[PDB]
Structure formats: C-alpha cells, structure tokens
C-alpha cells in the first residue's frame, strides 16, 4: 500500500509542479479559514509555490526531476489548521441543530 | 427564601413599605406619582425645576445647613424624575434611620423655594438643556416619545421646553407642589437594615401631614438630519401593553432573545396602560438601512419562527437580570417605590419566576405577533440619516410576504 501510494503520488503529477498536497485543496470556506490562520512564512511559501505552478502551467513545462516534491517530503501543513476549522464548524452546527 | 415586602398605610394614604435585610445601610426614598404626564403644557418643566429646588433648603432647615446635615452622617442624597414618577432617595446607615426620614419629610413638605434660587436654578436648567442636546440617545428617545405620542401629555419631555423653563414662578411651582404631592399618591419605601415598625412609627411622627387631595400611539416618524455628526442614532418602537398587563414578562423574554450596529439596545418602557417597545441603535450612515433590515427580520422571525432553546435562553437571561434582590439597596427600594406606585403591591420574585416559567415558545410568538406584526412603528432618527429608510420601507419591513 505504501509503494502503491507513492506510485499514485507520481501519477497525480502535482509534485512535478513543485506543489504540496495541501496546495491542491479547493478553497472552500473552511479551507480559506484554515489558510487565514497560517503563519506568515508558511502562507508566503504556499503563495510562491502556487504562483510558480501557475507559471509552469502557462509555459506548459514542469520542474526538473531533482526539484520535484518527494512524496515522503511533502508536508501536510494546512491539515492541522484545517481540522480545527472543521471541528469548530461542526461544533457550531451541532449547537444550532440542538 | 427572599424576605417579603411588607406594606402599611397611614390615614394620609402614604403607603409606607419596607423590606428589611441584614445590610447595615439603607435606601429610604419617597416616590410620588407625578411626572411630565400630569403637566398641562403651561407648567411643562415644573417637576424638573422643583427637583432642582428641593435640595436648596426648607423652612425648618434654611439653605445649605440642610445639606450639611446629610453630609454630617455621610449619607448620599439623590433624586430623579421620569414622565410618570418622581423619586427622592437617601442612602445612609441603619442607625441614622430617624433623621433621614425627617429629612425626607422636609423635602416633600415644608420645602422652601427661594426666589433667589429660582433664578440660579433656571440658569442651571437652561444651560444644561442648552448642552443636553449633546446627548444624542436622549435626543432620539425624546423624538421617539414626541412622534409616538403626538398631541398627548406623553409627548412632552421631562425637562420641558426652554420657554417654560424661563417662564416659571414660585406660585406655579407651588401649585405643582401642592397639586401633585398628595399623600395617597406617595410611597415611603425602605430597603436594607430597617425595621418596619420603627419606619411606620417614624412615618406616623413625620410625613403624617401630607395633604389628602388615556394616550394614543400615533405611529409616525421624526428625523433630525444633521450631517456633521459622526454617528447616527435610530430608535424604532411599537405600542407597549402597560404596567398591569402580564404579557410584558413575555415581551421581556423576547427582548432577552434580541439582547450589526455599533450599539444595539432593546427597550420596553412602560407607562400607565401604554408604552414603547422597541430598539435603539447608533450607527455610521452607510450601515443604517442594513441594520434596520437586520432588526426587522429578527422581530419578524420571533413572530414567525422561534425555537424552544432560544426561549430558554431568554427565560434564563431575564431571570438573572430580573434578579434584583440584594442587587443593591438603591435598586431594591427603587423597586418597592415603583411597585407600590404602579401595581399597587410589591410583586415577589417567586411570582416573577412563576410568570417566567409559564412562558413557552408558542405564547411568545403569539404575543409578539400581537404586538410587533403588521404594526405601525414610531421612528426617531438623529445624525446622518439620509440612508435611513422612510416610512413605507419600514412599514413593509414590519411584515413578511
């Protein structure tokens, strides 16, 4: 399962643009709240990575293979911050339900 | 376990009410059923100007020697006037209970209005009014009262128009004093470390001399546009039920549900079988209309769809707030004086709790539909109020399609 997940990570292809996994999340309301709660350095790296991926998609290029994002290396930075947004979101929802 | 408020009555009709408690300081006050509602537009500032003159000396205690006495025991002397009630209250120690009562007796009868003082208090009152305009929310609530009770004695303010203030004389005052200070319309209320029998004996000794002898809600709006002010104050109200109508309690729970504008306050002002129930908010010009829309939706919501839980919230909120027992002596008595003047009796907190717990969501939305839905409001705006909607838009926001 670990090797097949690495193969699927190579087949997804966002590592060839230098992106992380959390860069590829669709910005819903909860995702934008989690992005707003990021520290300044992580937010700046995320915006630069997104801008570089957009430039590479503009020129129809990819990064060199040494510059790709290694599956093992990818960091799920937004995840911790996101869970909270969802948790808080649900708590609020439940309160209203009841 | 809250001690009951015991009420006695002298021949004069002055109900002497007291509610003893451990606290060693007491708040002894006199309430009088006399306000701007009893004035007839020729003496529109008589109660206010008498409230200024009442501490400037009596016949027995001429001038500042009187207030020297209330400095000597370290007591605090306060007075206020509303559209329906006037109160003169003293916070003191328990052991100074007799002299305080005697002091209050002078303040209600045997009072002396010095002509010299009359000019000095006229300049005080005139000037304060000349600067009172500064307080916007007071201007907005006076405008709301005027446009809601057009043509009635409830439109006119407590202070009165500068005109009357300048044009007032001892005899006029004497009249208001001799007319609206009757013994059956007076309550001697005491709260805190007082004994009821001692207070009754003191009321028999002094104060036993006091002589024994509708409104129409015009739904409309007043707007004072002045664009130089930084913030806008808007009050919207409908007709209230009055003091004696129990659904007030339910309406209070509704206010506790409401509790977008920088400041949003709900009010239920009650007078004798009338009142103003509504909301006052103070906002920047470019937000005003949105506030109004917000506010009307809430009201409409309660009238349209209100859950069980929020009701519980209001019930509880009101409960804690309604809690006044041992909140403060000044409050405690204030409640005794108003309860004997309005209800004719002191409603205990257990009866308030029973009337709160009988309120559910169905009767709350029924009473809110009775008092808010499809009613013509009174609107009073002051400040940059151009984006404040006119009467058709507010009236259309008073119901849902």
């Amino acid at each position: 399962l670990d090797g097949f997940r690495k193969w699927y990570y190579n087949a997804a292809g966002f590592n060839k643009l230098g992106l992380m996994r959390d860069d590829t999340l669709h910005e819903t309301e909860d995702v934008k709240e989690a992005i707003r709660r990021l520290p300044e350095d992580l937010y700046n790296d995320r915006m630069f990575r997104i801008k570089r991926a957009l430039d590479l998609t503009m020129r129809h290029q990819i990064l060199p293979k040494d510059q790709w994002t290694k599956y093992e290396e990818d960091k799920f930075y937004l995840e911790p911050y996101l869970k909270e947004v969802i948790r808080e979101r649900k708590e609020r929802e439940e309160w209203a339900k009841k | 376990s809250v001690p009951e408020t015991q009420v006695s009555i002298l021949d004069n009709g002055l109900r002497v009410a007291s509610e003893q408690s451990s606290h060693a300081t007491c708040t002894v006050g006199v309430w009088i059923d006399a306000g701007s509602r009893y004035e007839t537009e020729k003496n529109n500032g008589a109660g206010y100007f008498l409230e200024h003159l009442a501490f400037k000396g009596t016949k027995n205690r001429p001038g500042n020697a009187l207030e020297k006495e209330v400095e000597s025991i370290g007591a605090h002397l306060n007075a206020y006037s509303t559209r329906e009630h006037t109160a003169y209250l003293i916070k003191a120690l328990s052991k100074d209970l007799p002299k305080v009562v005697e002091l209050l007796a002078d303040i209600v009868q045997n009072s002396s209005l010095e002509d010299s003082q009359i000019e000095k208090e006229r300049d005080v009152i005139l000037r304060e009014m000349q600067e009172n305009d500064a307080s916007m929310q007071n201007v907005v609530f006076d405008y709301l009262h005027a446009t809601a009770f057009q043509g009635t004695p409830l439109a006119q303010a407590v202070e009165g128009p500068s005109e009357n203030v300048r044009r007032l004389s001892r005899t006029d005052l004497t009249d208001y004093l001799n007319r609206h200070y009757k013994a059956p319309r007076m309550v001697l209320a005491a709260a805190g470390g007082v004994e009821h029998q001692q207070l009754l004996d003191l009321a028999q000794k002094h104060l036993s001399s006091v002589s024994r002898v509708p409104c129409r809600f015009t739904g409309s709006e007043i707007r004072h546009r002045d664009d130089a002010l930084p913030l806008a104050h808007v009050a919207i109200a409908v007709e209230g039920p009055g003091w004696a109508n129990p659904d007030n309690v339910t309406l209070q729970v509704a206010n506790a549900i409401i509790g977008l504008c920088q400041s949003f306050q709900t009010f239920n002002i009650s007078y004798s079988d009338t009142g103003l129930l509504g909301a006052h908010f103070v906002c920047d010009a470019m937000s005003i209309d949105d506030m109004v829309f917000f506010l009307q939706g809430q009201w409409m919501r309660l009238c349209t769809s209100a859950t069980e839980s929020e009701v519980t919230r209001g019930k509880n909120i009101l409960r804690n707030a309604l809690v006044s027992h041992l909140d403060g002596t000044t409050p405690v008595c204030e409640d005794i004086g108003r309860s004997l003047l309005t209800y004719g009796r002191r409603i205990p907190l257990a009866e308030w709790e029973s009337r709160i717990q009988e309120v559910d969501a169905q009767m709350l939305r029924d009473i809110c539909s009775k008092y808010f839905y499809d009613q013509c409001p009174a609107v009073a705006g002051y400040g940059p109020i151009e984006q404040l909607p006119d009467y058709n838009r507010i009236r259309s926001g008073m119901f849902w399609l």
């Binding site: - | 307080s135 916007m136 929310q137 930084p230 913030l231 920088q262 400041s263 103070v282």
Partner: protein, 51 residues
C-alpha cells in the same frame, strides 16, 4: 548658523512653499473625580471605565 552645528535642520523648519514619503499618516458612542481607575470588561456586559 554658527550655533547650528549639526542640529540646524532640527531647530529650523523650512516649508517648500513653491518648490521616505509620508507613510499613510475612530468614533464611538459617548464631572466626578479622584476615584482610582479600575477598568472592567465582560463576556456579555459591555466594558466600562470606573474612573
């Protein structure tokens, strides 16, 4: 002048008249005295000054 030394532009001000930039250099709803300050704030009750 002579007294200026290196503090002239500090003891003197010169408007350009006719011949870093300024870095972009509110309103709240509105006596007694001498009771030491004790500021209070609350979750529900609005904050206040007890001057």
């Amino acid at each position: 002048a002579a007294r200026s030394g290196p503090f002239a532009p500090v003891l003197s001000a010169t408007s350009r008249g006719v011949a870093g930039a300024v870095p972009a250099a509110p309103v709240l709803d509105v006596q007694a005295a001498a009771r030491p300050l004790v500021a209070t704030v609350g979750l529900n009750v609005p904050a206040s000054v007890r001057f």
